[PDB]
Amino acid sequence: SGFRKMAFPSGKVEGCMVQVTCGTTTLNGLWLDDVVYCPRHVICTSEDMLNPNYEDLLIRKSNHNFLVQAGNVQLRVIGHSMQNCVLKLKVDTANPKTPKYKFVRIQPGQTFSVLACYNGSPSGVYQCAMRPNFTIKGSFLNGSCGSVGFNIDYDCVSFCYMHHMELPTGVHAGTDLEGNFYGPFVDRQTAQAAGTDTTITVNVLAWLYAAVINGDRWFLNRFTTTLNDFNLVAMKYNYEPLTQDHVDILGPLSAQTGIAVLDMCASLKELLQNGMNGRTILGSALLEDEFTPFDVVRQCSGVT
Amino acid sequence: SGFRKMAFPSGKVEGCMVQVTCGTTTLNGLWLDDVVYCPRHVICTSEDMLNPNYEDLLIRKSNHNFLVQAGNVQLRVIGHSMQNCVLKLKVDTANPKTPKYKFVRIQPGQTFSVLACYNGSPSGVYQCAMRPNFTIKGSFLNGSCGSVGFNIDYDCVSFCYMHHMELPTGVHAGTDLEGNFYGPFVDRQTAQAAGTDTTITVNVLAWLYAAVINGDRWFLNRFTTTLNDFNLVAMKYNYEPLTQDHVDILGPLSAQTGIAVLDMCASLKELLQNGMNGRTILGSALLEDEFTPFDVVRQCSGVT
Ligand SMILES: *CC(=O)N1CCC(NC(=O)c2ccccc2)CC1
Numbered sequence: 001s002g003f004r005k006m007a008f009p010s011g012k013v014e015g016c017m018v019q020v021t022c023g024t025t026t027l028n029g030l031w032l033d034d035v036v037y038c039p040r041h042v043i044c045t046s047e048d049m050l051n052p053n054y055e056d057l058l059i060r061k062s063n064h065n066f067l068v069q070a071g072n073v074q075l076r077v078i079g080h081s082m083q084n085c086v087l088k089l090k091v092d093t094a095n096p097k098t099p100k101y102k103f104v105r106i107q108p109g110q111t112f113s114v115l116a117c118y119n120g121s122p123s124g125v126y127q128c129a130m131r132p133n134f135t136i137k138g139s140f141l142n143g144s145c146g147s148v149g150f151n152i153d154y155d156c157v158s159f160c161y162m163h164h165m166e167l168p169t170g171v172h173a174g175t176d177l178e179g180n181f182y183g184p185f186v187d188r189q190t191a192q193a194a195g196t197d198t199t200i201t202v203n204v205l206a207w208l209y210a211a212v213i214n215g216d217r218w219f220l221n222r223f224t225t226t227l228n229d230f231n232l233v234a235m236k237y238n239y240e241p242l243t244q245d246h247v248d249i250l251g252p253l254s255a256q257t258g259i260a261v262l263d264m265c266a267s268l269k270e271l272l273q274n275g276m277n278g279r280t281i282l283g284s285a286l287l288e289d290e291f292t293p294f295d296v297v298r299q300c301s302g303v304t
Numbered sequence: 305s306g307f308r309k310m311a312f313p314s315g316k317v318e319g320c321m322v323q324v325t326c327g328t329t330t331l332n333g334l335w336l337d338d339v340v341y342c343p344r345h346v347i348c349t350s351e352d353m354l355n356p357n358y359e360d361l362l363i364r365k366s367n368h369n370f371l372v373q374a375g376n377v378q379l380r381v382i383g384h385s386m387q388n389c390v391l392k393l394k395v396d397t398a399n400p401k402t403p404k405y406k407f408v409r410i411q412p413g414q415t416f417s418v419l420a421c422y423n424g425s426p427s428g429v430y431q432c433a434m435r436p437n438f439t440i441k442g443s444f445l446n447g448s449c450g451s452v453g454f455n456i457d458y459d460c461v462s463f464c465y466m467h468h469m470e471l472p473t474g475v476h477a478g479t480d481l482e483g484n485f486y487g488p489f490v491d492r493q494t495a496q497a498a499g500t501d502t503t504i505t506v507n508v509l510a511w512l513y514a515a516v517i518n519g520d521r522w523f524l525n526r527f528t529t530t531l532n533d534f535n536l537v538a539m540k541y542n543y544e545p546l547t548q549d550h551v552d553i554l555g556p557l558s559a560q561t562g563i564a565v566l567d568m569c570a571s572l573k574e575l576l577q578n579g580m581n582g583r584t585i586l587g588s589a590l591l592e593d594e595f596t597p598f599d600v601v602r603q604c605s606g607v608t
């Protein structure tokens with residue numbers, strides 16, 4: 001029993017983190033096979049970052065200007081290219097610790113672990129979600145750019161995120177590992193405001209299932225609802241619309257608990273309308289939305 | 305910016321987890337040097353667990369009854385002893401992945417990372433605290449016993465916890481790595497009830513500092529208090545008494561923010577008396593008490 005916000009074990013990814021220095025800027029790179037991936041803003045002076053022309057800035061850079069250090073050993077750079085907003089530094093040595101890996105582009109609502117690094121050294125690991133506004137709510141200080149987000153399927157690491165930007169509101173923007181930003185954000189120090197941070201309805205319901213499975217049941221009630229009725233209340237409270245696809249995805253948790261998805265919807269409706277009344281659910285005073293249905297089944301069944 | 309519940313990177317500990325089977329019971333062991341550490345209840349039948357005599361049960365066990373598997377390779381057991389509530393299985397091979405390590409016994413209020421494992425395989429990592437009642441609030445299913453709690457100081461892993469027991473109330477009890485239970489708990493299926501789960505006052509204050517550092521400031525007020533006055537309000541709300549030692553420990557966060565510890569005490573007093581009024585602090589609707597002052601400085605300065 002018990003239910004915790006849980007990160008993937010980080011060893012496989014720890015084995016891929018290096019330090020990248022270009023001029024006076026140090027941040028993190030990802031070493032997979034003979035390629036090191038890093039944010040292209042490594043080539044910027046703080047000055048450049050106001051309106052950088054990356055193709056023009058890159059012309060002034062040679063392979064020998066990209067200092068790549070794995071622990072205390074230097075790596076030899078034999079090539080460099082820009083793909084979107086990442087640099088790919090080709091090195092003469094394949095990472096001997098390369099795990100099986102994929103590059104995946106996740107959807108909003110999907111969760112992943114972040115290994116926060118500084119100067120290519122891991123500081124900690126925590127669980128995130130891609131927000132509906134395509135931001136993430138991270139912990140990232142100067143030097144943490146190039147930290148990555150990942151899922152693990154048994155022995156295969158799926159890299160979904162590389163950290164690039166803090167918005168003036170203290171939320172975070174980055175890319176997939178092809179260097180394409182999640183959402184409308186750019187690697188430029190400009191006016192960029194996040195949209196509405198809506199709540200991931202399907203994740204909340206999954207977490208309500210996790211609560212029942214673990215003994216927290218006070219919020220169960222005698223009511224049901226419809227998708228359309230529920231969605232009226234979702235709209236008013238800035239929750240994502242619930243689709244039949246979301247209902248279908250919650251089917252296994254429905255099966256295990258014997259609580260129909262739409263009955264659990266009626267519980268969530270009352271919680272939105274009435275509040276918690278100073279009570280808690282799995283040690284939280286608000287409705288948690290950074291557990292996917294997949295996360296809940298994984299943790300409640302003990303997958304490794 | 306940003307502040308997240310953050311676990312230590314888990315690679316160093318992943319490299320120490322093995323599977324231990326005695327009869328029909330499988331759980332996790334910790335392989336450091338040529339010793340595998342595991343809960344002595346591995347030798348129990350579910351039946352034994354009502355009133356086990358461990359010395360008598362152990363007589364019926366030989367080295368060859370302890371099946372120890374590191375990934376897919378079996379380890380040869382050449383010795384076994386009981387120390388308190390752990391078994392030490394001597395193996396003929398030193399773990400080549402042994403990190404620098406210590407065994408430490410932590411105090412209530414101190415935090416640590418747990419690497420949840422099943423059949424010697426890591427499933428995830430999360431941050432905990434030793435509760436004032438000497439329980440922890442974990443996520444532990446059947447097969448997770450022998451999972452360990454740790455801190456990392458740069459390159460040295462300090463092992464503080466091994467998972468042994470779930471109480472009927474869904475909270476968790478275990479040992480240090482000398483096999484001594486935290487608190488009054490025993491490895492017996494009996495009536496064991498946790499005491500008052502009081503709030504770790506010094507941790508809450510540390511987290512309030514983390515909030516100010518990261519821009520969440522609405523709860524700052526025009527008031528101050530005294531240790532004695534604050535402690536009257538702490539008592540009523542089941543908070544640990546605040547000592548001068550705790551004030552001294554918060555000094556650096558005091559220095560950095562320029563908010564006197566006793567002013568921050570007056571903020572915490574008003575929050576206890578008035579509630580959150582539907583507002584949040586670092587994305588939480590309750591006062592977080594599983595960040596130590598040390599955790600807050602570490603994360604806010606980016607130590608690796
Ligand atoms: C995220 C990361 O590690 N970095 C990106 C930000 C870099 N610093 C700056 O360019 C900067 C900070 C503040 C004002 C102006 C410029 C450090 C590396």
Ligand SMILES: *CC(=O)N1CCC(NC(=O)c2ccccc2)CC1
Pocket residue numbers: 329330331349350353445446447448449450467468469
């Ligand atoms: C924690 C862990 O991995 N284990 C301890 C509990 C073991 N199961 C039992 O002895 C048991 C469970 C339920 C009823 C009776 C006995 C599995 C291993």
